Amino acid sequence: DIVADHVASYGVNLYQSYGPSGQYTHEFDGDEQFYVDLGRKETVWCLPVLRQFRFDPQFALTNIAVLKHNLNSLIKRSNSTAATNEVPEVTVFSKSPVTLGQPNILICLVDNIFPPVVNITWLSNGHSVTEGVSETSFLSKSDHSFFKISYLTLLPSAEESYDCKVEHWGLDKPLLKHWEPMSELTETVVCALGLSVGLVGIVVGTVFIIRGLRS
Amino acid sequence: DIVADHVASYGVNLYQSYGPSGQYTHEFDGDEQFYVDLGRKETVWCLPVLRQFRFDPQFALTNIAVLKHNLNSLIKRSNSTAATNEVPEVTVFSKSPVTLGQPNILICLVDNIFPPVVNITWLSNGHSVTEGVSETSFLSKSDHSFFKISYLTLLPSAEESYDCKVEHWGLDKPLLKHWEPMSELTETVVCALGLSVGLVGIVVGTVFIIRGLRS
Amino acid sequence: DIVADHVASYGVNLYQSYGPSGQYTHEFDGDEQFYVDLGRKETVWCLPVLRQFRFDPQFALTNIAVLKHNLNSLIKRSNSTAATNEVPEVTVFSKSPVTLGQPNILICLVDNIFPPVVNITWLSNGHSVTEGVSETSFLSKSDHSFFKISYLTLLPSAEESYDCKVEHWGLDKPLLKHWEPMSELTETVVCALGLSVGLVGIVVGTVFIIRGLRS
Amino acid sequence: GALYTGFSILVTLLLAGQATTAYFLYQQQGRLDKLTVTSQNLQLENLRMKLPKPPKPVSKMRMATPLLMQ
Amino acid sequence: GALYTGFSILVTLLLAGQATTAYFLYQQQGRLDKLTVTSQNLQLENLRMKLPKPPKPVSKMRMATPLLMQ
Amino acid sequence: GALYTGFSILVTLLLAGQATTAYFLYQQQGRLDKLTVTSQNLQLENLRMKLPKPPKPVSKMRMATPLLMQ
Amino acid sequence: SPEDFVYQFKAMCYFTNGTERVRYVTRYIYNREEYARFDSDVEVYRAVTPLGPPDAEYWNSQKEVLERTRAELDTVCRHNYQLELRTTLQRRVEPTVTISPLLVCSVTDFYPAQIKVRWFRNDQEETTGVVSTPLIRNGDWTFQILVMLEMTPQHGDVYTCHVEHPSLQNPITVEWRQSKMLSGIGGFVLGLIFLGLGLIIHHRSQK
Amino acid sequence: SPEDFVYQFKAMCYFTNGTERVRYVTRYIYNREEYARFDSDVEVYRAVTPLGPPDAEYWNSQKEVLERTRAELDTVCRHNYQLELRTTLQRRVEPTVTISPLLVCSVTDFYPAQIKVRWFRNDQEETTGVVSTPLIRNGDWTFQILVMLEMTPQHGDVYTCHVEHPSLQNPITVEWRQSKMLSGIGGFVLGLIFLGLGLIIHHRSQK
Amino acid sequence: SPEDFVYQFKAMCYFTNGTERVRYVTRYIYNREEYARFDSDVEVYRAVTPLGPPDAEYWNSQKEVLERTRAELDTVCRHNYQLELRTTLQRRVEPTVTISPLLVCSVTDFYPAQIKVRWFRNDQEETTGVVSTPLIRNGDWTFQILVMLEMTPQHGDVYTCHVEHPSLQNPITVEWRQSKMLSGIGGFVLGLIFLGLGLIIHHRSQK
């Protein structure tokens, strides 16, 4: 292992035979700086302060073409050893403390993903949600696995609940991770002070006469 | 005629000698999927869920170049038969039920347009409006005419009225289609319950003494 | 000098040896129509109604390449006469009348800039502000100097003050231009009318009995 | 003694006025509840204006080409 | 009998207090009317953020080119 | 004479009711002050949505290239 | 009115049922006059107006081009329709229903165009008089429809507008129904006099 | 202070009246020193400073290039000005006027720069003391102007700021004008005592 | 479970201190099994698994390519790190602290990951029981951390959560503390009876 103040991975290239599909990302201290959409040949920056730089998308496509040729030469030498599917770990938590009404972003973290093939979807009372849902790219680990994050911009409601549906080859059945978010006492308290302050003002008005009565 | 569940027109190409001008649109069940801005060589998608696909703008320009050559060969054989200008039909209606204050979009539908040359503008108390005005492309029909729609994002006001000015060669003069969007009773009703509930509370206070008077 | 109704400068090209850096802008009646980002080879229009036109960014790069070659031939003939640094004039004012709470844009106008090298930054109680800050391009003058404007979209607060930090070679030290934006009387006035209107209603209620007393 | 008669009218008018304040106070709470929902729905839009969506694989649409008139 | 004297002051203070509630209730209705306009003007912006405009024909701007110093 | 006894209860209940109106009136002013801040923070976003930023000079990021397996 | 010549071309795919049956017609129009057409159920260029034979035979003569257009039934209609399943045919928007005074039931902002709207009079389908405005295409992949019916007002009578749409698993129903102030005025004033009288009776009985 | 050399080039078109008269000058500047220039009213390159003759004759020698630049009066100035009519010269923004305490009349966010502002004292144009801040160019195609005037306050006296602008069909005029609480206090208390006295008089007359 | 083969490549730069020391490792992974690697502290390709010698010697044989990769320590790691100083290493976001009932102190939306959080019990650092949830990476260049501690409630006792972060010049501290209605009820009612009694005493003394 290597211990350092900052770690940057400027060559994270991915390729697999299932699609075939690939991915290109740059990482600095565990966060994604940008990714290159291979199909559209465009560089999408993940941080606003990083849009001032330039990275040629064609640079990414050249690298992944090498990985494709490398993989075919390795399948023969490995005698076609398929990837051992793993069991993902799914954790759901709120980005900010949950206050009813204020906008919030749900975070579903799928960890230990291998191969990089997963379907992360959101459920609201059994119905799929396709509004305000965003995902991050497959982010690398040190054991050569991946983790992905799905966001759900939601308005918290006490009557509404959500689930994170994670489908992967390593799960026998689809995995669901759940997430769920005084009037009488206040009325009694309000009335108690009301009659008290009412009697307090009444006493002074009566006291004023009583004090003035002697004179 | 042809009867089918769904109708798609993946080759709607337009060209005319007046500009000269042309248009390229794709239609599915009578709605516009996208259009290719010929001058800017760009593909503008009209539906957000359709931006994930790709259509080369240069493909559209090749097709319309063929229509230009085809038209010149047809003008000679037709002995220069000019287009017979038609009388457009203009209908103005609100996209949503008109509630004063809530945002709404006006819809002006110009139907039976031929040739595809029309000026659709909005008037507010006699002055042109150039804010929040948008239009759709010339959408095809079965009699080989066209219809166009102009939108006016407006905030309804009881003191404000709007008109849709449609200029076409088939109209002798420009056509205008117009569109226009309890306190005393409420005050009397509020006062009536006020004195009634006032007397109701007064009676119980007097009744409480009267009941307690006997004891 | 030349006197005319409208003045347009369709060839404002800039180049200097410090960077080396350059600039391309089009001006009409003293306002910037667009600029061509030389590094990114993109045309950024400064007025929304002007986005309908097209200007090739490569056109700007050809012109500035000529200025670079012209400058090297002039440095020899001028025997390397460096630019005489000037003293900028800094003025800070609000775009709209300052009402506490309503959004506003601060305007810092640095005038008489030469050479076109300046750092304009905003300070809020001694700390740099990097949110909502925008600047205009170096706009030309008639004495062949420049002026630049920096905007600071701010929400006015009576407890918050701002400064415009202007750094230039012609200033010995950095220049700072500053900008800074009844309850008892209202309470007494409210109480004065309260007891007055209270006594006014009391009199009529007593007067009603007095008038009815005689009958 | 008509003094107590006068006080009787004042109290009834005073309580009638309090009904009006209660009615308008309840009326305004409808606006605030409605304005709260609109304000927080607008805040949600802002939140989504700064979040993109992971793109799907690119599949091209298909077209037809006309022919030439000789 | 000073009991009726005491009740006299209480009613006047009670009606004085009701004037204050009415004044602040009227004051808040100015904010709600102003906030309603700002909320619905912001809703209008959102509505326009999702609607483009049909482009006009493209006409290119013209420029001048400098010369070379031999 | 129980008539004055009756009036005594009415005034106390009347002032108790005025306390409730004052409490809810103060309560609503918290919402308006909070709603005012959210409304004007949303107005600020709109203002910034129409203002770009002068770009910085372009500097390219660097990458590494893998090798071929013979 | 300046002279103008318009030439338009349309490539139309017709999908009956699923991909079971598909028709492909390409239409050559010259000023609202289609003269040459291709029919997939004929697979041969035809002429509609006398301006056709010059182009019908020539296009059909070139076998290489004729085979290219005949193959567009699969490479254009069937290729694009696969993408239509994921995005456009999958689009569904829930309708909104409002009732305002006849009595108009406005159903707005829904897609697709299949919809059924019913009017009820206390669990009785009021089919006596119903006038339906035809489907209105807003242009933004949305639709409208207006249904109105005459009313004979009655005390306690209610009217409900019943709608159903492919986007909805459960149908949506919306109902419609100084008077309250007047009703409370009589009850309170009578109650005000009701309690006042008992004071004298209690006073008289005690005395 | 590092040494720096600045070279700038300007192509300026001047439009007097409509397209009736146009001047075209191209300026070659070397560190705020214009040395070579083209004048459409001369159609011949000239030299301004001693650094000019080396470039003035050489550029004028090439007839092909010299004719190219002389033709830019039509292909640059007159070509672009046609587009200026539709978008920039057509831009008009209505001014906004506010009055605050001298007494400053702020006219903000207007375009173009033509404007006339007047101060009135009860339908009398107060021209005694008026200090005008010059036109301020905000930079965003907008303009400002501030007008202030000294005041001698009077009871019931009003002041109105009068503005006019090419974007406005009708001129815009804005006016300016515890005291209310104090005034009502005296009237109500006097009315409070006015009604109270009548009770004794009615009591005395009845008695 | 369809068969799938995954090949991944990683170019990782390690920055110890400033640019004083830099390590550069390129990793060739075949299904979570890194077989060939480059180490800047070795400057020679090595083999990790038996699938390495076929590629380790061949890549190291080509001197032109081997020198190219060894030079990436400066043209990739040190080139990019200069840009990291201006934008990413310069990014700092102030944390937000909220306290809710144990007692959890939520610190949300901060960057970078260096942070220290303390719990106080009346200016005494409560270190008896504190359970800290590890750093949570939201994914949007933000971080979280949750600290909870058990409480023994006391009258007038307060708890403050103390945080410090590189983005903050001064540490941020947030504190936490019908009862008011009940307390006022006893005081007012007692005061109500307090004034009432004096009326009789004044009446009795006068009488």
Residue numbers in the entry:
A (entry chain G), B (entry chain D), C (entry chain A): 2 to 182, 188 to 221
D (entry chain F), E (entry chain C), F (entry chain I): 47 to 116
G (entry chain E), H (entry chain B), I (entry chain H): 3 to 103, 114 to 189, 196 to 225
Quoted passage from the original study:
pmcThe major histocompatibility complex class II (MHC-II) molecules play a crucial role against pathogens and foreign antigens in adaptive immune responses by presenting peptide antigens to CD4+ T lymphocytes. The assembly and trafficking of MHC-II molecules are regulated processes involving invariant chain (Ii), which acts as a chaperone associated with MHC-II subunits during MHC-II biosynthesis and antigen processing. Previous studies have shown that Ii forms a homotrimer (Ii3), associating with MHC-II heterodimers to create a trimer of trimeric complex, Ii3:(αβ)3 (6, 7). CLIP lodges within the peptide-binding groove of MHC-II, acting as a “placeholder” to prevent premature peptide loading.
We determined the structures of HLA-DR/Ii and HLA-DQ/Ii trimers to a final resolution of 3.0 and 3.1 Å, respectively. Despite having similar resolution, the density map of HLA-DQ exhibits superior clarity. Within this map, the TM domain of both HLA-DQ alpha and beta chains is distinctly discernible. In the HLA-DQ/Ii map, although density is observable, a poly-A helix was constructed within the TM density for both HLA-DQα and HLA-DQβ. The overall HLAαβ/Ii structures are approximately 140 Å in height and 80 Å in the longest dimension of width. These assembled complexes adopt a C3 symmetric trimeric configuration. Specifically, in our study, Lys102 and Lys106 on CLIP exhibit the potential for forming polar interactions with Glu55 in HLA-DRα, as well as interactions with Gln53 and Asp57 on HLA-DQ. Glu132 on the adjacent HLA-DQα (chain D) engage in a hydrogen bond with Arg94 on Ii (chain C). The full-length HLA-DQ/Ii trimer complex, with an estimated molecular weight of 480 kD, transformed into a stable band of around 350 kD upon Cathepsin S treatment rather than Cathepsin L2 treatment. Based on molecular weight considerations, this suggests that Cathepsin S likely targets the region of Ii between CLIP and the trimerization domain, leaving the oligomerization of the HLA-DQ/Ii trimer complex largely unaffected.
